[PDB]
Amino acid sequence: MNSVTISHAPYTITYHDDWEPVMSQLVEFYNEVASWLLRDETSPIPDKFFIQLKQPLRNKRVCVCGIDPYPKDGTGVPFESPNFTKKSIKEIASSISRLTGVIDYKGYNLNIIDGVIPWNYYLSCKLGETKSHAIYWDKISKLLLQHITKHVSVLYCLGKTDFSNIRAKLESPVTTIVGYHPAARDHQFEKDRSFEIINVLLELDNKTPINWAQGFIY
Amino acid sequence: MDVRCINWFESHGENRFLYLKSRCRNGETVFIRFPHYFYYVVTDEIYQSLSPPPFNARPMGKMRTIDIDETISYNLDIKDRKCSVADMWLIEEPKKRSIQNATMDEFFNISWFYISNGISPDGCYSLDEQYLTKINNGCYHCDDPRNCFAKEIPRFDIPRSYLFLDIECHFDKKFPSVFINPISHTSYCYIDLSGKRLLFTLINEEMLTEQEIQEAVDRGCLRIQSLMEMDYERELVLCSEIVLLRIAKQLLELTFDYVVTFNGHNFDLRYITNRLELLTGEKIIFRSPDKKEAVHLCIYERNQSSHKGVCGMANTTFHVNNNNGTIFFDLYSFIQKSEKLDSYKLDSISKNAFSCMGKVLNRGVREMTFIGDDTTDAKGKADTFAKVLTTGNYVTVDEDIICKVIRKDILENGFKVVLSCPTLPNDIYKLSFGKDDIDLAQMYKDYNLNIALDMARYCIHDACLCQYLWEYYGVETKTDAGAATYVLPQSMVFEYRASTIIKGPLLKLLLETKTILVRSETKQKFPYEGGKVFAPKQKMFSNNVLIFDYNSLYPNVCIFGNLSPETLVGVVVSTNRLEEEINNQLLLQKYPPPRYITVHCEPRLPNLISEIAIFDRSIEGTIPRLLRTFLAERARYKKMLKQATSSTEKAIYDSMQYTYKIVANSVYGLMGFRNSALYSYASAKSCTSIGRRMILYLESVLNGAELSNGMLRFANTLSNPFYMDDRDINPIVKTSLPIDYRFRFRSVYGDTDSVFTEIDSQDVDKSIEIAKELERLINSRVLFNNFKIEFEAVYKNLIMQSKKKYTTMKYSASSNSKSVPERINKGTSETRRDVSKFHKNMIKTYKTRLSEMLSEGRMNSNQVCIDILRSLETDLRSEFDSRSSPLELFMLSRMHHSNYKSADNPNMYLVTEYNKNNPETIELGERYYFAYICPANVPWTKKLVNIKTYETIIDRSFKLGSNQRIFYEVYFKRLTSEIVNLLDNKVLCISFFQRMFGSRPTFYEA
Amino acid sequence: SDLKVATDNIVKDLKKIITRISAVSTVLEDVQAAGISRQFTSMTKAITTLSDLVTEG
Amino acid sequence: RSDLSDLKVATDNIVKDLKKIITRISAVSTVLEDVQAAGISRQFTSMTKAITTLSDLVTEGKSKVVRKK
Amino acid sequence: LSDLKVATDNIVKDLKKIITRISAVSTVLEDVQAAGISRQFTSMTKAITTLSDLVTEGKSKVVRK
Amino acid sequence: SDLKVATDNIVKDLKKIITRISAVSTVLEDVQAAGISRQFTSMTKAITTLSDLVTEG
Amino acid sequence: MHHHHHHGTGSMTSSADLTNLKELLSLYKSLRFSDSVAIEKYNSLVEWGTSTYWKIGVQKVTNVETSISDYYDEVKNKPFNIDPGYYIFLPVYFGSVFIYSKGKNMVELGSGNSFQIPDEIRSACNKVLDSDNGIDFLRFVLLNNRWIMEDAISKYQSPVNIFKLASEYGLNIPNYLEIEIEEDTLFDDELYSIMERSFDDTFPKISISYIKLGELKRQVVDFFKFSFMYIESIKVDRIGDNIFIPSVITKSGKKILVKDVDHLIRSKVREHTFVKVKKKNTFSILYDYDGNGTETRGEVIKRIIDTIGRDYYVNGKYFSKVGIAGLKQLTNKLDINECATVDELVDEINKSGTVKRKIKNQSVFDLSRECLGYPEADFITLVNNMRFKIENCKVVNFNIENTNCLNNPSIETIYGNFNQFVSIFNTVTDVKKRLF
DNA sequence: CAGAATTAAGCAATTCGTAATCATGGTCATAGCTCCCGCG
DNA sequence: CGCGGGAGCTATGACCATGATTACGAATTGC
Ligand SMILES: Cc1cn([C@H]2CC[C@@H](COP(=O)(O)OP(=O)(O)OP(=O)(O)O)O2)c(=O)[nH]c1=O
Ligand SMILES: [Mg+2]
C-alpha cells in the first residue's frame, strides 16, 4: 500500500504492493499523457482515476474489464453508480439476478465482490463521450491489464467491439471472455450467461468460484 | 449516365446504407446510396414458414442443396449425397435476424448485393437515371440496383484522385511519442481531378526562430498564419503546427479516391489526428456523401489470428474509419501481405523495388556520375529509377554504401545521377533508393533551416515514394482486378485473405450453377500427405537440367477429377486387405472409370490401411469450375504479362498472375483448411494424391527416357495412371527434331509438379529447343485432359544442397545460350529471411569458390577442403577480431506474431520486452530486425547455450554500444554448418566444427 | 580323473541350482534379484580366473 | 519345494548354496594353480569345453535376473 | 635381515594361502566323495600323517616359552 | 594322479616352511609366536577335518 | 471496414458454449475413470476452450493412468478395528476390474481401453445410468466371461438401491448384506470368513469393500498370506463357446485361478516355476505382478501356446480354440435358432427383425470375425499381410506374403483356421446379398 | 437510449534453437567378505 | 580352542554430471 508522486493533478496515487512492478512505468507514461489528458473535463475525477490501484491483485482471480468509465457521473470505480441510474450496472444486476436468484436489491457493486476486480481499460473519458481518452490511456491500459492478467485467472471483457483487440493488448495467456456489453443493443447481454462461464472457467483452473450475490447492495 | 466504380463503402448506424464511389466521363464524382440490408437464403417452405414477412424477397429459382459432409464408409455402399432441389428465395432484411436452417450464411451482404443485382464491383455502368433519386449534389439513391445497373459498358479512363503522404516527427528520444513530440514536416502529393500532381511540404515554424523563418521566406518558402492563406502550388510552406494540422485535416476530409501512406495508419495519420486533438481539439471529420452521418478519424487496430497451431494473433493492420469513399490505403500492410522481404520498412522496400543497374560515364574524386537506360538494365526499370529520382535524395550503390545525390537529371529514356561516392573500379553497379544513412535524432538535436529543408526533401521523397510504390506495384490495377475477380469492394480487396476472396466468385458460381452447400456434422481435421518431393540424385550437376512445370497442378487436379466437396460420392475405407480387395473390385464394377475417378489415398486413421475417394465427374463441381474461373483470370493476366514490355508493368502483371496462382492454390488449400466451409478432407487429400501420382508418372516417364534417331522413347508406357484412357500409351513418340540429336534424359530431382530432367547435353540452345520439343510431346501424348506443362528453364551448375534448396543458372525458354543467365536461388541462404547479409555474402562467395574449383577439376577434394576451411578460418577470425563489417549486415529478422504454443517463448518475450522498454511498439505481423548481441569482453564461446537470450532487436535508431558486440559465434556456426554441408571430407569437417564450435556439425543425408 | 569328476559334479549341482533359479526367478524381488545378480557376477569373475588358469597355465 | 510361504528362506538357501559353489570353484581354481605349479604335463581341451558349458549355463542362469525396468 | 618384521610378515602371509589350499583339497575331496566314484585314500593318508607330525614338531619348535 | 602330486607339492612347500622357521627360530618374539601358534592350531584343525574326510570312507 | 470488428470474437458467452464448458469440467473431474472416447472428447473441449478463451486451467492429456484410487483407500492386509455405524459390505471379485463411465462405454482399469461387450448388458448399464445421473462410475468385474456389478460409486444415492434396480434390469449383482456394527470389534479372519460365507456367491471373491454412510470414501479390506507354489501344468477350461479361461494347476493339486490371459502373460507363468499366489482357505488368487524374467511378451505367448496347444490362440482376455466352423457357430453368435442351410438362415434372419437390423448395421468382415471369435487387432494384423483373390465379395483364394506375423502364434493359429474363416465369410456374404 | 457487426489456404522439408531422453562415465554408498586380533 | 569386535579390501548397484540423440516447435520457403 504505497504512494508515488505524479507531476500532474492526481499528485498522490495510491497503489497496493501487488501493483508495484508496473508503477515505475505507469508514472513514466502518465507524466507524458496527463498534460494533454486533463485539459478535457474527465468523467471520473482525476483524484479517483487510480482508486482501483488500491485493490490487491493476489486475492483477485477474476478481472471484469470495461473499456472506459461511464460518459457521465464516473465514480472511478468501474460499474458503480450510487444513484443506480447507469444502464450497464442495471443489466449486470439483472444478469446476476437471474444467476443468484436475488430479485430484491438497491444497487450492484463489483468492487465489494471477493475475487473480482472491476476494471476500466481506459481509466477515463470525456464528459458525454465514449473512448475519447483512448489515445491517452493506450499505454497505461496495456501495462495495467498486462499486470492484472498475471495475477487473475479469468479476464471478463465487457465489449465485443471494444475488446476485439484484447488478445493483442495482452501477451501473457489469460482466460479471456470477450463478452457483450450490457448497454449493447438487441439485449445480447440479457441473452448470454457469461457469469456462469466465469465460475466454470475458475472451476477448470481449480479456483474458488465467484459468489456473485456479494455484489448486491441491500 | 456513364460511371466507373471507384469504391464501394458501407455506412453504419441509424438507417444503414451502402454507397458507391463513382466517376463520370466529365470528371464529376458521383455517389449512389444503396440500401444495405442483410441477405439470407432459405427454402420455399421455410420462406413461407416465417410469420414476419421479409422487407423484400425475390426468387433465386430451384437450386439443389448438397450436404458436403465426409463419412468414411467401410462398406462399398454409400448414401447418395443429398441433392434436395428446392425453390430458394433471397431473404432481404434491413435488420439482422436469425433464421432456423438458413443457408448460405458464409457469404457477405456486399457480395450478395453484387451478384443478386448483377453488379461487378470493377465495372463501367450507364446508370438508368429514374431509378436514381437525388439526395444532394453528387449523391444519388437507387432502390432497385438490378434495373439501374443493367448496361455494362466497357472500360473508360477516369480522372482518379490521389493524396500520397508521409510525416516526420521530432524524436529527441528513440521514437516519437504523440504527446511530447511535435510534427516537423507533413509532405503531400495532391493529385486532383484536373490531374496535376502538386508536391508540397508543410514545415513547422515553432521548430525554427523568426530569423530562420524570415530566411526561409527570403529563400522562397511561404509563411502562412491561417487556412485560407495556404497555397497548394508552393513547394515548401512554413506554418505553425496548429495551421499545419488544420491543413492536414482539410486535406484528409477531401473526397479523394485514394489517400495512400506508408506505415501511415499506424504512425502518420494516427499522429496527425491525435496531435490535432491535442493542440486544438479538432478531429478529422469524414462525412457521408448524403451528409447524414459523420465519423471522426479513429485509427482502429485490426488483428488477424493465425490459422495454424494455437491460432494466435499473427498480423496487425491499421485502417481508417472512413465513410466518404476515400480508400485510405496503407502501403505497409499491402506490401507485408504481398511481398516477401527481410523487413518492410520503407527504405528496405525502396532497396527491393527501385533497384537499377547503372553504367558510369564520369568518375571523380568524390562525385561518381552514374547513367542508366534500356541498355544498362531492363526496359522501364530506368524510367522507374528516374521517376523516384525526381524526388529522391540518397541512392544506395551495390546494396552496401549510401550516396547522396549531388545533381539530378531526368533523361527521356533513363536517368542521369551524380552521387557522393568513393571511386569504384567496375562500370556497372546496382543502384537502389533505400537508406538515408543519417542520424535523424542528431539532426533534430541541432535543428536549423538547412536541416529543416533537407528533411523536407527527405519527407517529400517519402511522400512521393508512396506514389512510386503505388505505380511500381500497380495497386490501382491490382485493386480493380481484385474487385472484379473476388467480387469485393475496392477498399476491401487486399484486406481480406484467401477465404473471403474465394467467396465472391464462389457465390457468383453457386448462383450460376444453381447450387447450395450445407453441412450437418462438424468438420474433422486429419493430417494427409502433401505433394511428393524427390531426393536429389547428386549435389552438383555439371550437365544441363530441364525444368518441366505443370500449369497450375493442384487446380488442374481438381478440375480433372472433379474434386469438390459436393462431387465427392463418398469415402471408401478399409482396415484390412480383405475388405480392401472386395471394395477395390466392387468399386470398379459399381463406379465406371470415365465418369467416376477412384483416388487411392493415404489413410486418415491408423487402423485404416486404404482410403479411396470417389468423385463424380458427370456434373462439374463448384471447386473445379471456380478454379476454371481463377485460372481464366490467371491466363488473361499471364497473356497481359506476355504483351507487357516495361519492367514495371511486367512486375505488376507477373504479381497479378502469381496472385491468381496463389488464390487458385487457395481454392486447393481451403479444402485442406478445417475451419473453411469449403473444407473437404477427401478432396484435398485426393488432390495431393493425384498430384503425387502425376509427379510420379511424369518422373517415371522422363527418368530413363532417351532420344534416338529423331524419335523420343520413354522408360515406362504413357498410361493414364488412374484408369484406361482413349489416348495411345506408346512411349515411342515421333519428334520434330534432327536425327543426329541422340541424348538421354533422366530425372534427378522432383518437387511438387516440377521434375528436374537432366539432359546429358551441356549445350544451352540445344537443350532449350529439345526441351521445348519435350514440352510439346508431353503435352500432346504423355499428359491428358487439362494437364499441361511448361518448359520453364535450363538449370546450369545446379547446386542442390538438399530437397527444396538449390542454386543454379537459369536460361528461360525465351532466353538463348548467348543471353545472360539469371542466378536462381530457391530456399538457400540468400533467399531465407532468418539469414544475415554477411552470411548471404560469404555463402555467395564460397559458392563461387567451390563452383570454380570443382569446375576446373585440377585440385583434389581433401586439399580443397583444407584450403577452403583455412580460408574460412582466416575470414572468421578476421571478422571476430577486426569487426569491420557493421551491424546491418548481421541483422536477422522474423515476423512478430502471438502464435506460440508456449506461454514463455523467448521470441515473444523478446518482443514484449522491447515493446515495454522502447517507444516503438512492434505490432503483430511486423518484421523486426534482431541480432545476437553479447558484451564485448566475452571471448570466443565454444559450447553455445542460451542463444535466444542473446537476441537484441535492432532498430534504425539503434546503435551498438561500446561494451556490446555482435555475437559472431552463432552466425559463424550456421555459416560453417552450411559450408560443411556443401563440401565433402566429413571427418575433417567434424573435427573443424568441434575445434571451433565444440559441437558435431549438422549433416544432410541423401 | 578326479579333477574331471569333481567338475562334473560341480556342473551337475549348478545345473540343478539353475533349474531352481528358473523355478524361482519369475517373481524374485528387487533386492533378491540384485543379490543373485551380484553372485552371478562373482560367478563370471570366478570362471574368468578358471579360464585364465586353463588357458595361460 | 511345494507351497512355500515367502521367497526369503528359499532365496537365502539359493544364495547359501551358491556361496558353497563359489567357494568350491575358487577351491578347484586354487588347486589348479598348485597342479600347474607342480610342473606335470596336462592336456585340458576337454576342461576348456567343460568351462565353456559352465559359462553358457551361468549366462543362461544369469540373464533372467539381470535388469529391472 | 634386521628387526625381523619382514620375516614375520612373510611367514604370516603364506600360511593363509596354505590353509586355503588345504581347504581346497578338502573341498575337492568332498566333491569326489559326493560324486560317487570308488576311491582309496592310503597314500594320501600317509602324506597327511607325515604333514601332521612335521607340523606338530614345528609347533613344538616355534613355542614362545 | 593330480591330488597326490598336489599334496606332494604342499609337503615340499611346508618342508621349505619348516626349514626357514627352524632357521629364524633362534629368536621369534612373543606376540608373533602366539600368532603363528594360533595359525598352527588352525592348520591342525583343517588337517584333522581333512583326516576325517580321508578316514570316513 | 471496422464494421467487421478488430478481430471477430465467437459467442463464448452463449449458453451452448456454457454447456460445452460444463461438459469440459465434468469430464475433467472424470478423467481417471473415462474411456478413450471421453478422453478425445475432453481433448476436443480443451482445444475448443483454448481456441475460444485465450487460456483454460486444464490441459490436453496424451495418456491418463486409469485408476480409481481416489475413491478407494489403501488395502489393509492386517486386522483392524471397525467403527460403529452402518456399512455396506461388498465382495471384490477376482477378474479384471472394469468401470462404466458416464460416456456409456466400458473402461478397463490399468489400460483405459474400451472392451467390447454384449448388447443387452450395455443396455442394462445405460438404463442404470439413466436412472441415476449422480453416479460417477459403475465398478464391474470380468471373470469367467461374466460381468458382475461390484459397486456403484455415486455422489448422492447409496449403492444398495442401485443394486436391486440393476438386478431387475438384468445385471449381475452379489448377494450382499448390510449390517450394523454394535461395538469396536477386531475385524479378524474368522469374521471375514463368515462374511464371505454370508456372500452367497459361487464366483470367487478376493476381498471385501465396505462403504460408510457418513463418509463417501470407501476402503477395500483383504486378509491373505502371500504364497509361492510350484506349478505342475497350465490348463484352459471352457467358460463360453470358443472362450477359455487360463488356469494354473500346482503340484499339490490345488488350482490357482487366473484373471485373464494378459494376467498369465504379464506375470509370465511357466510350468515348473513359482508364481505369487494369494492364499485363502477356499481358493487361490494369482497376484497381479509383472514377471521378472528377461523373456519378451511375444516369447511368453510362444511358450504359453506351445504348452497349451497350437490350435489355441489369445483372444483378448480369454483363450480360444479353433475348429471346423459352420452354420452352427454363426447361428450361435447371432443368438438365433440352429440352422441347417444358408437359405433357411436368410429366412430366419428375415423373421427376426432386430437380427436383420444387426446384420444390416455391421459389416460382413466384423460379423465373420466375431462368429469365429477372432480378436480385433490380431486379425487385422493377420489380414494386413495377406493378398486375396476374390469373386463376388467372396474369398476364392487366400495367400500370405509376409511371414513376420507368423512368429505370433495367435496369428499363426488364426492363419490355420483361415479356411474356416473364408467359409463363414462366404456364408455371411451370401446372407448379406440375399437379405439385401 | 446506452454497441454490434467473422476471418482464417494446404503440406514438405530444411535449419536452428530448446528441452526432454538416453549413452557413457565418474563417484559414492554398500553389502560381501575375509582376515587380524583378541578374551574368555 | 572358539566366536565376537574391528578393520580393510573390493566388486556392485544407485545416483549424478556431461555430452550426444532426438522430439518438437518456430521461421522460412518451396511448392
Ligand atoms: C505456390 C503454391 C503451390 N501450391 C501447390 C499447388 C500446385 C503445386 C505446384 O505449384 P507451383 O508453385 O509449382 O505453380 P502452379 O500453382 O502449379 O502454377 P504454375 O507452375 O506457375 O503454372 O504446389 C500450394 O498449395 N500453395 C502455394 O502457395
Ligand atoms: Mg506449376
Coordinates of C-alpha atoms and ligand atoms in Angstrom, one line a residue, chain B residues 549-553 753, ligand 2:
Chain B
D549 CA 6.4 -27.3 -64.5
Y550 CA 2.7 -28.2 -64.5
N551 CA 0.3 -25.4 -65.4
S552 CA -1.4 -24.9 -62.1
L553 CA -1.0 -28.5 -60.9
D753 CA 4.9 -30.6 -60.1
Ligands
MG2 MG 3.0 -25.4 -61.6

